[PDB]
Design an enzyme around this catalytic site. Sequence first.
Site, PDB file in Angstrom:
ATOM      1  N   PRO A  34      36.406  96.829  27.666  1.00 48.94           N
ATOM      2  CA  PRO A  34      35.106  96.143  27.761  1.00 48.94           C
ATOM      3  C   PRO A  34      34.430  95.855  26.399  1.00 48.94           C
ATOM      4  O   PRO A  34      34.488  96.694  25.484  1.00 48.94           O
ATOM      5  CB  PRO A  34      34.229  97.093  28.583  1.00 48.94           C
ATOM      6  CG  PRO A  34      35.106  98.181  29.063  1.00 48.94           C
ATOM      7  CD  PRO A  34      36.421  98.147  28.313  1.00 48.94           C
ATOM      8  N   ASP A  35      33.787  94.677  26.298  1.00 46.84           N
ATOM      9  CA  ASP A  35      32.895  94.356  25.187  1.00 46.84           C
ATOM     10  C   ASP A  35      31.446  94.861  25.386  1.00 46.84           C
ATOM     11  O   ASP A  35      31.193  95.702  26.231  1.00 46.84           O
ATOM     12  CB  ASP A  35      32.906  92.865  24.917  1.00 46.84           C
ATOM     13  CG  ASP A  35      32.356  92.046  26.065  1.00 46.84           C
ATOM     14  OD1 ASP A  35      31.829  92.600  27.059  1.00 46.84           O
ATOM     15  OD2 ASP A  35      32.461  90.806  25.964  1.00 46.84           O
ATOM     16  N   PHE A  36      30.511  94.360  24.581  1.00 49.09           N
ATOM     17  CA  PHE A  36      29.091  94.671  24.729  1.00 49.09           C
ATOM     18  C   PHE A  36      28.432  93.688  25.680  1.00 49.09           C
ATOM     19  O   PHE A  36      27.769  94.101  26.617  1.00 49.09           O
ATOM     20  CB  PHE A  36      28.381  94.602  23.375  1.00 49.09           C
ATOM     21  CG  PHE A  36      28.491  95.866  22.539  1.00 49.09           C
ATOM     22  CD1 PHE A  36      29.520  96.780  22.731  1.00 49.09           C
ATOM     23  CD2 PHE A  36      27.566  96.123  21.528  1.00 49.09           C
ATOM     24  CE1 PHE A  36      29.609  97.931  21.954  1.00 49.09           C
ATOM     25  CE2 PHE A  36      27.645  97.277  20.749  1.00 49.09           C
ATOM     26  CZ  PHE A  36      28.673  98.185  20.962  1.00 49.09           C
ATOM     27  N   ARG A  37      28.667  92.388  25.463  1.00 53.27           N
ATOM     28  CA  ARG A  37      27.831  91.317  26.031  1.00 53.27           C
ATOM     29  C   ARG A  37      28.349  90.544  27.254  1.00 53.27           C
ATOM     30  O   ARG A  37      27.613  89.729  27.810  1.00 53.27           O
ATOM     31  CB  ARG A  37      27.388  90.358  24.924  1.00 53.27           C
ATOM     32  CG  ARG A  37      26.350  91.001  24.015  1.00 53.27           C
ATOM     33  CD  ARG A  37      26.071  90.213  22.749  1.00 53.27           C
ATOM     34  NE  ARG A  37      25.020  90.870  21.966  1.00 53.27           N
ATOM     35  CZ  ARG A  37      25.207  91.837  21.044  1.00 53.27           C
ATOM     36  NH1 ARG A  37      26.424  92.330  20.721  1.00 53.27           N
ATOM     37  NH2 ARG A  37      24.148  92.323  20.412  1.00 53.27           N
ATOM     38  N   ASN A 108      36.856  94.539  15.651  1.00 49.87           N
ATOM     39  CA  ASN A 108      37.358  95.525  16.615  1.00 49.87           C
ATOM     40  C   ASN A 108      37.816  96.851  15.988  1.00 49.87           C
ATOM     41  O   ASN A 108      38.259  96.882  14.832  1.00 49.87           O
ATOM     42  CB  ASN A 108      38.475  94.938  17.500  1.00 49.87           C
ATOM     43  CG  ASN A 108      38.008  93.740  18.333  1.00 49.87           C
ATOM     44  OD1 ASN A 108      36.812  93.460  18.431  1.00 49.87           O
ATOM     45  ND2 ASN A 108      38.956  93.031  18.945  1.00 49.87           N
ATOM     46  N   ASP A 110      39.951  98.856  18.057  1.00 51.06           N
ATOM     47  CA  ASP A 110      40.963  99.271  19.034  1.00 51.06           C
ATOM     48  C   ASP A 110      42.365  99.297  18.440  1.00 51.06           C
ATOM     49  O   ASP A 110      43.302  99.649  19.140  1.00 51.06           O
ATOM     50  CB  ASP A 110      40.927  98.394  20.297  1.00 51.06           C
ATOM     51  CG  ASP A 110      41.063  96.901  19.989  1.00 51.06           C
ATOM     52  OD1 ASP A 110      41.818  96.525  19.047  1.00 51.06           O
ATOM     53  OD2 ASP A 110      40.415  96.089  20.694  1.00 51.06           O
ATOM     54  N   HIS A 127      35.240  96.889  10.553  1.00 46.32           N
ATOM     55  CA  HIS A 127      34.297  97.855  11.089  1.00 46.32           C
ATOM     56  C   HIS A 127      34.925  99.218  11.210  1.00 46.32           C
ATOM     57  O   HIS A 127      34.417 100.079  11.950  1.00 46.32           O
ATOM     58  CB  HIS A 127      33.663  97.416  12.426  1.00 46.32           C
ATOM     59  CG  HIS A 127      32.568  96.412  12.261  1.00 46.32           C
ATOM     60  ND1 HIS A 127      31.942  95.800  13.334  1.00 46.32           N
ATOM     61  CD2 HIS A 127      32.001  95.892  11.141  1.00 46.32           C
ATOM     62  CE1 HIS A 127      31.025  94.958  12.879  1.00 46.32           C
ATOM     63  NE2 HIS A 127      31.040  94.996  11.553  1.00 46.32           N
TER      64      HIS A 127
END
Length: 273
Positions: A34-37, A108, A110, A127
């Site tokens: 899942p993402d944030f938005r 990302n 991940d 990040h």
Amino acid sequence: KLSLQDVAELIRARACQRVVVMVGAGISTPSGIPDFRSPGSGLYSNLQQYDLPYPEAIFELPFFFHNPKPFFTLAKELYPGNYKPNVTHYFLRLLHDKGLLLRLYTQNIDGLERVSGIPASKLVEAHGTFASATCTVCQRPFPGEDIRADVMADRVPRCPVCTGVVKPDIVFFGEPLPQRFLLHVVDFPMADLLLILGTSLEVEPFASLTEAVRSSVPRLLINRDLVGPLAWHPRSRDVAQLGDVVHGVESLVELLGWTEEMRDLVQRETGKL
Ligand SMILES: [Zn+2]
């Protein structure tokens, strides 16, 4: 005003030779992460499975030191092994393999870019990464494996030297981006095509990199929506391909005549894992 075909044709004509790519969580939702938005599945609508006041808290130090459990749950979920790259990733891999990839900048954490075959030197994990951790008190460095057991047993990792909380080298709000990020000073001027994929471009200094390419350079966005300095500083050579990320990638891949090649690749690759 260029179309998607124009951009494929530019590549086909070798008019475009040095592609930079920016990506965010949207390229990894088809992998199940899942993402944030996104609606429903995005972190914004799932704050209780996680016990967050708001999504960003998981990457803020004050909340982290107050309560590292939610972050470490996500660390558990995302720890190398768990998810696999999808077609969006392998397309980028195929870009590399075809001699087109200058650099890939990713928000990302991940690791799926590494997993897909893109070599570290072509990557800027902007990040941070789970590949390594740092003790938050004494600053002692640790390889990611050194804390895997704790993370997997739902125990907060601890420094063997000072007992401080050991934090994976993910960049938190207000922390500096890693040294490799600096490659953007020479990468962006040198680039003759900018690809942007699955990001809301809500986060700086990563987002305003879209501004750092020359005006002659087309910016192709593949995303659910028109976002960031592309929605309010539209340039004349911008292209928006709106819809599913994987779908956009497929339409492009076919225009480039890469389809059987990418299927052989996806096939051979996901099998190994
Ligand atoms: Zn320590």
